[PDB]
């Protein structure tokens, strides 16, 4: 099911540019109550109007741990509205098509092509993280933080 | 100008009087003082009645609504800001604006009541004792008012909570939890059904039972409402609600705002993008704390029975 | 950067309240009631050595 | 030496005094009966009972109070460990007082300057004895009613 | 030493003083009426105290 | 464990010289209703604020019963407040080094070099016994009390 | 020599019982500057006028610092003025006579009984220590302090 | 200065006591004295015959 972050629901503001191209950050983060599992997605932050991702830092506290980990980190651009509890909501692999962070703590950068090919749309969108596959043993409480930069006016 | 407030407290003697002929003009008292500091901050917010495109594919005018809704914001944000104080810590209360990660407000910390001022419902001893049974009770809030009498007689070291003009005169005032107050007149062994019974067989219609919330018990004026403190992690072995209820009493908690005659919503506005987002964004200066003279806070005591979600069907 | 007076900077003022916050004293039960000079009182005043 | 009723309250009347930990055993139990007594009150007169609105009323012919000064033991008991207290029964003269100073109690207010004017001092004090009444070797005028009041909030640090 | 507060300490000593004493004088009589000075704190007297006079 | 002992509490009364060089002296005693442990912080009594501990007698009685005793008594001062209940607060050896009173019941007055020269202080600091060896087999509700002269206006 | 402390110059202060009886204490010290020498009298302090010795303690540091240290200060009251700088001023031996302290650190108090029998006189005597014999070897900055309890109406 | 007289042992001793209330420091902005400088010159008395 779809687990929020605090920043989905609206308790806390996402910010947005007041120029146009002004590179603007915010650490997408949530706290995870009880263990990941293969199928969550895990909507993390609301990606504001009219901007467009152009760097994404994905930081993750070794979800998985125990040993041989299978765990993958996919996160998106869900099509969904900014925090609907709707559970038909989809997460693409855009930014990061398999991250393979979690099964190690560590910091992973966006590095397929599509991060920066993201279209603008004029509503809000709400950036997932879906797990793609399920992880061996698992953690409770370890976090999952994205740091997403977005421009607010590109053409 | 300055951002803390410092008030004291002047605690009674405790030393043993000479008897007999003995010279005492040597043994003198030494008068002991307490204090406690508030530290004031600013807190602001900001509405954007957006675009110029927004707002005229809208028939309302937005930044009418964006105004009232600061204004309404910033009414809940200072009700649940006492509540929080006056409770000490933050649940999971949902519908509080603060984050549930949620530490202070000014470098005044949360304070977590002493053994002394919190109560248990039902019988407990700590937090990771309670069951089903230890739902409030007419018995706990009696408790309630026997350690709000009896503080000093088992700590020499407090202060006596004394009442508050509510109502008539001099009343306890006992703020609930709207599940608590469920739990007493939705239950035979909370107590309260069968004096209230009896009320009504002395008035007809007129009783709390059917017209109203809770009456007096004890010279306690009880009310319920919604911004009362809420955990989930009590319980033998964690994922057990609770609440707080507030035993008020005088001096509780402490509010310095930080601008002449009393707090001052003063709105700022400011444009962006060659004059589209017109945003409106408002703020007070002010800094709340709870009384804690010494390491004994000095006018609440938090009962801390607790409380289930009575309709399970709400969404976790 | 910018200016930030900070906390707890000696700069910063503190402004000390003049009022008292008073532990007040438990209400006496044997008031002038109980006490008396009559043999009708709990507790009885014999003035038989007050001038004497 | 049979009591006699006191008049302080109402008209010949004995007061008894109550620690309100006996006083929470009383209005927090059924098999302390007040409870029924007062819940058939309250039907004849309600949210003017002393279930909602205060302390104890009398129980037979005797006012009760509450007190936070009242005596309460911690070694009675089988195990020495029973918490306990001592309510009392008064009427007429229970105890006397010798004030011995002038006409009521006259406190003796006195400031002394203790150097050059630095440490001012303020000593006061009363030169007066108390003593319960007791003829032959019996009380005269209380019955210590001498129950088992447990701290209703285990809590407190005791 | 009263200097470094706006208190002023006489005011506050006199009214101490006078609470001071009026606690006593109640607490002395329910030590006398019931007899014992039990294991009650609050009370200025000690725990093992017997008269006064 | 640090023993509150009456004298450092508000309940007994520790007596101001008044005028200057004025010998004073107060009975610091504690009735030990426990047995002494390795190691103990006992806050015999308050040496009044702004006055200089001229002649200190030591008043003990038998602590130890069993044979070849070993408790020794270190007597000095406690800084921190007047009676605040923490462990964190630790005496030092200023008025007794290091006592052999401990092994039979006797009086052994101050005879440290040091034990004259302790400084003035504008607060009230305390006087406290830490046990600094081991209680061997004995104790039982004893007392310990010590005999200060504490002098004000000192120079 | 004639190394006068602070208080026989008046520099510091020396206290007086205000009724008959009250045992007053001042320590009388001095940081004595070069080395302690045969013959030398150090003029520590000054009992008032109406004074009689009560109880002397005198407390020193290590005067001496060789191999068989065989110093012996000797304390008692003077002859002339308190302030008067004549080397024509002897001490005696009435409170202390071979102390034979300052070998080691030390706390000694009176033992001869002729340091309680000590007769008053309406002016101000001044007591002064003179080391009778030789000082060994060594000491520069060490510290002699001596301290007096007196009482003023003594019969 | 607030002047005080006491007398002690029954009018023997009549005394005088009196005393400001007052402090003083040397402006230490930092670490600098913000006002003083201390020359450390070499004063000799000229005379021999002078005491110590």
Known sequence: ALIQSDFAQGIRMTPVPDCAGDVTACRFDITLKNAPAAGDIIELGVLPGNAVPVEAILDVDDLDTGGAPTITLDVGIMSGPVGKNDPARTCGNELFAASTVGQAGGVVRATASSAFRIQKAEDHRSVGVKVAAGPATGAAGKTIALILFYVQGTS | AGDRVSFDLSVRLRGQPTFGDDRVEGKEENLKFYTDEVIIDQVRHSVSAGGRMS????????????????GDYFYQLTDELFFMYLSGARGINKDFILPTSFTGYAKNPFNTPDAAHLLYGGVATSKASLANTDTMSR????????????????????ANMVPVSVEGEDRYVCVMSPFQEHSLRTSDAAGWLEIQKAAAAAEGRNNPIFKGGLGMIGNTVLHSHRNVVRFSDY?????????????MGRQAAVVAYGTKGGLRYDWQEETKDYGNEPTVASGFIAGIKKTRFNDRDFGVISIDTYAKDPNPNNPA | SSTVIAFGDPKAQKKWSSELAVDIRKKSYFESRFIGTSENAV????????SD
């Open chain 2, 55 to 70: 707002r005229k594919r809208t028939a309302h005018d937005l930044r009418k609504t964006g105004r009232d809704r600061l």
């Open chain 2, 139 to 158: 018995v706990v809030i009696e408790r309630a008012n026997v350690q709000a009498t009896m503080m000093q007689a088992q700590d020499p070291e407090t």
């Open chain 2, 235 to 247: 319980g033998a072995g964690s994922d057990q609600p609770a609440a707080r209820a507030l035993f």
């Open chain 3, 43 to 50: 507790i009885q005043r014999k003035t038989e050595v007050e």
